[PDB]
Design a protein around this ligand. Sequence first.
Ligand SMILES: [Tb+3]
Ligand SMILES: [Tb+3]
Ligand SMILES: [Tb+3]
Ligand SMILES: [Tb+3]
Ligand SMILES: [Tb+3]
Ligand SMILES: [Tb+3]
Ligand SMILES: [Tb+3]
Ligand SMILES: [Tb+3]
Ligand SMILES: [Tb+3]
Ligand SMILES: [Tb+3]
Ligand SMILES: [Tb+3]
Ligand SMILES: [Tb+3]
Lengths: 329, 329, 329, 329
Amino acid sequence: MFEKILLSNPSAENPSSLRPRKGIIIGLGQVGLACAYSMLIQDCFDELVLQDIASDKLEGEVMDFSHGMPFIPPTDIKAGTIANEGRNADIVIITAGVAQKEGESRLSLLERNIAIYKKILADVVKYCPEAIILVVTNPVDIMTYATLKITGFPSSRIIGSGTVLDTARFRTLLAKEMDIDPRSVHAYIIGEHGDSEVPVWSTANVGGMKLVPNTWADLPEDEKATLSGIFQKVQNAAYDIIKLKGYTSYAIGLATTDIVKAILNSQERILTVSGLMTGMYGIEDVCLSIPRVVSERGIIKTVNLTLSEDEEKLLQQSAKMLKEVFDKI
Amino acid sequence: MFEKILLSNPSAENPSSLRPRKGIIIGLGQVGLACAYSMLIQDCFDELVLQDIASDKLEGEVMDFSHGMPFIPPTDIKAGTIANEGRNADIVIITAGVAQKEGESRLSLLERNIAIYKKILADVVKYCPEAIILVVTNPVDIMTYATLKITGFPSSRIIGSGTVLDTARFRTLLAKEMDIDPRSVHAYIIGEHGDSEVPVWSTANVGGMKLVPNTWADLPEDEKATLSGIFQKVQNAAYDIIKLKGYTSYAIGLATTDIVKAILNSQERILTVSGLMTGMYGIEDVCLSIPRVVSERGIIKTVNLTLSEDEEKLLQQSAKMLKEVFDKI
Amino acid sequence: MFEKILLSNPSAENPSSLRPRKGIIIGLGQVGLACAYSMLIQDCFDELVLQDIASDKLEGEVMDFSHGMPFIPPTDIKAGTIANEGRNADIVIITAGVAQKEGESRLSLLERNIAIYKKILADVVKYCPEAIILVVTNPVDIMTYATLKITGFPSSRIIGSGTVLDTARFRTLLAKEMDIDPRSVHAYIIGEHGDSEVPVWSTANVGGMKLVPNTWADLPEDEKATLSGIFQKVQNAAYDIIKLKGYTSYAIGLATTDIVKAILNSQERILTVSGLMTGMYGIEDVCLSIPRVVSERGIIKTVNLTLSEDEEKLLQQSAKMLKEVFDKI
Amino acid sequence: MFEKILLSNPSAENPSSLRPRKGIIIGLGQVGLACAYSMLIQDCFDELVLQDIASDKLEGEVMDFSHGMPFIPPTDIKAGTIANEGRNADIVIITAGVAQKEGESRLSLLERNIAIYKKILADVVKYCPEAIILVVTNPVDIMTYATLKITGFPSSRIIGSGTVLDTARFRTLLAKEMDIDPRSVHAYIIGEHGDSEVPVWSTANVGGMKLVPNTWADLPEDEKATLSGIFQKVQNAAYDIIKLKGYTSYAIGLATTDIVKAILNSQERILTVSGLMTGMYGIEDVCLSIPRVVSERGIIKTVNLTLSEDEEKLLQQSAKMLKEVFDKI
Ligand SMILES: [Tb+3]
Ligand SMILES: [Tb+3]
Ligand SMILES: [Tb+3]
Ligand SMILES: [Tb+3]
Ligand SMILES: [Tb+3]
Ligand SMILES: [Tb+3]
Ligand SMILES: [Tb+3]
Ligand SMILES: [Tb+3]
Ligand SMILES: [Tb+3]
Ligand SMILES: [Tb+3]
Ligand SMILES: [Tb+3]
Ligand SMILES: [Tb+3]
């Protein structure tokens, strides 16, 4: 019908059946919904699958997303599962998890979320063998290492959100202090995501210049107070979001979207994602956040940072405690 | 400090103190938070104020937004009020309201939300005299007319979200049926936002061609079933979101953002926003959704649609019932 | 080397060997260089081949383009030929041609450019069988029909620049007169590209409203003068560019780029490109500009415009004269 | 008229009379036309004035630009002069100049172009007192210093294109060698624009890591050959464009546009533009290219690079020869 409006051309060939850039978000709580809303507005995928337990809410959220799509670039948003709608997805973003019950042990919450991952990752290994797994569930360093051991995927394709969020705020706050384009600053926050993450002051760089030209002790007193207050501001912000709101959703959603951009657009961009440590600083068999080149096939290269003696000791201490916690599980 | 990194140029003049494009969202529930997240990602404002009752949540949401800003274009996001941080805002977006209590009358819920608006709009009139007020609270046609009567603003600057959302879905679904760019379709949903909104089939247009070249009765039977099913699909989607999720947030957030774009960028774009009826079709003293040219100063022009006899009767019936409901308040 | 800066990840898989969106411009005079500069800045292709006779200029232009690429999105720009670098290109844009010698017949210039096309299109048929051919050489309607007969390609993939440029100016000037978004106006210039192109006033539409609600004779006198002056302004601009500059390059370059966008991004967008007439208005065996839906596989659909009696007679007269000119070749 | 299509709203206020971002290009040869085409496509200005001697070509170029505008964002492009259409422009881009006659001295060509600048800059000082002057005419370091002495403007607002083009190619080629995002590389080409420009290998940085961790002599032999070949590739490209084409237009046009972006969008971005040397490395009373933070008011800050002994000697030698050449004028 409608041939009186638009007359079809008989010589026109059928459109190509191109493979869509395809993602799936597992766990559609506040974090997963924030990721979905951002990735839809920023047009990350051609097809986006949302997987959670069958409820009217999940379907209502999907229909809410679908009804607003005309205002943004198109995306085939839908509810589904890995084994069905989500087969051969390019990126699998896992935000699924459960909240710590009243009086529950930290090891008990880990074993509960790890059990949740084992059921999830079994479908990912079977139906998304070539996919990159982006882990967001906390603690992200433990869950990223568990995902690596459960899946058996190449370590390059098991990626955790890590300290990407705090590093970006660290970079932006430092550039704001100096009235300069934030893309001119290379300052990394590495290690275990949380209160023990390490700012790499020794290699912090602004447009080629070292923020610490010699050693930290040689810096003027006012610069040491200003630089230390900037990193403290980053840690205060992450803590206060959990204290005032209970959790982060919008910030981690934007950081997760940014990681997806580097992967899908093959940007070869430096990101402090969480990933397997393989020999650097004598650290093995654990996941930490280190600046890495991220592209279509995941973690392609690692920035071979030379840490100061104090910075490296903090990193190896975090690696020791993370290996101990995982051995207890 | 940091003059060993960046040497300030003595001849450099101070930067200009330009006036920021400034908005304020009142009511930071699910609708207001969705609006804020979208307007931040899409970089609508230079400064965005979020006003709601003083809570740790609102401040936690603001800090969540602020912590994720490095990943998107900058916006000075903050919590505040109209009388303080929000003075002389360009756009005031009102999503504030209360939920219908168990057994509460529809007239009782209106009088409660109208009382909420009277306290809000008193500050808007005093401190944002030149601002455009974008009304989103339901029922949007009643609340838009109440805002016009309370503020005394020019009717061009009192704008309700109206049927912009359903019209965009209507336009996109029709273009998808015909395998054509949605920007080639001009098909409007007008009237009262809800189950009684009117699709203007008589003037529905695709790239210059009328979807209904003569009258609706002259259309082939299969085209009448297909066209009627498309509008029914639009109304089913809006109802099912409320049924499954309880409310819309992401869809209305994107539609509200789209209205803001037309205003702040002076796009002179046709939008079926809700606004004061002033003589067209003999309708007066009420707010309905009609295609209007929207730009920097609000509703600039109105598309002078010629409705069919059946379409106009439905519109005048909705105007009659809306005037009766408001007289009872 | 450089492993002390970036440490390669052994588990990282090799990047995918995706097929690049590939175009080739034949004829790098002022028109072809303008097309290339625009298509590079607007990031149309992943790989762009420039074919002209072997000279230091062509290679100098390519090296000039290559040296400035860091400031725009990447494109593998290079000099080459259809049979080598340009094999299996997605779009073949032909601007090649020769200037009319002093005292040369219009039929002699056609037979010279047609001979140029026969040598070019032989390589296109052999090495770019699935490509879309975008014809820009003047007269575009004759050269588009010659390309169709020489190649034997499906008529959907033989596209001429046609009246796309003048239609866009026509649309923009009309919207400027009415203080409205130009995307709300559907006003087409059809027929033979030149002084005899036909403005379709009978179906000219603004946001659903007909500019001519009844007949042109029924319009008020001042509206008839204003509307006629707008189309006259379009024809004066195209003539004055040739009179003052000698040719158009920047305008036709932007119009050609816009056609490429609709093809490569599968936009299904209405364009008055030149193409084969197949029965509409009783016109056959000739190329004219008619509003058509353009997408990945070329001319997919045709807007089935109902012309007025005067508009259709002008169109059939242009078809008669174009068929006579081609028969003489 | 047209009130039967669009009904004007009586309560609608008049649009604001905002000040347009305004630029003017002086000299519309191949360089100026390339700048104009790029700045129009990339939507740099709200109003762009093109100044050259009164000819049918200039007006034909302007009309060619104007006729293609519907395909890109709007810009009020026009022909005019500084004293009339170009009053109070934000940026004045000067590409004007004359070609070296057969057997003309290098000092004679300078005195001819300097005389051209004196007539131009007299109008700029009178009618564009707060404007930033972007100098592109060769030799850019001499012409930038002449512009500073003729105008008497603050040295922060006299900017030459300098080595911005070669630095961007240098940065991109180095990042391509390492399979990394080019924004992670800070490698500068400084000094006199030409064959004697200096690559700052001592501070070349990739994501925080120094390309030369100790001294250049300590680098492995293969890395020294690869790094030296990359800079040689940059100098070969700039020379071959002049050898094969006679001049650069597209590359310098994109580089000039990039400088305009940093100014108009207040990006505070590091650019190796040419500017007045004021004490650094003991260099005074001359213009050289040094990494500088560029924003709305011009050169705001200077990256305080610590050069190696060999790098600094080459820079001071170029400063000595540039001061000698200018003293002879
Ligand atoms: Tb595969
Ligand atoms: Tb400051
Ligand atoms: Tb060590
Ligand atoms: Tb004002
Ligand atoms: Tb279809
Ligand atoms: Tb009536
Ligand atoms: Tb094929
Ligand atoms: Tb006007
Ligand atoms: Tb007929
Ligand atoms: Tb001023
Ligand atoms: Tb490689
Ligand atoms: Tb020194």
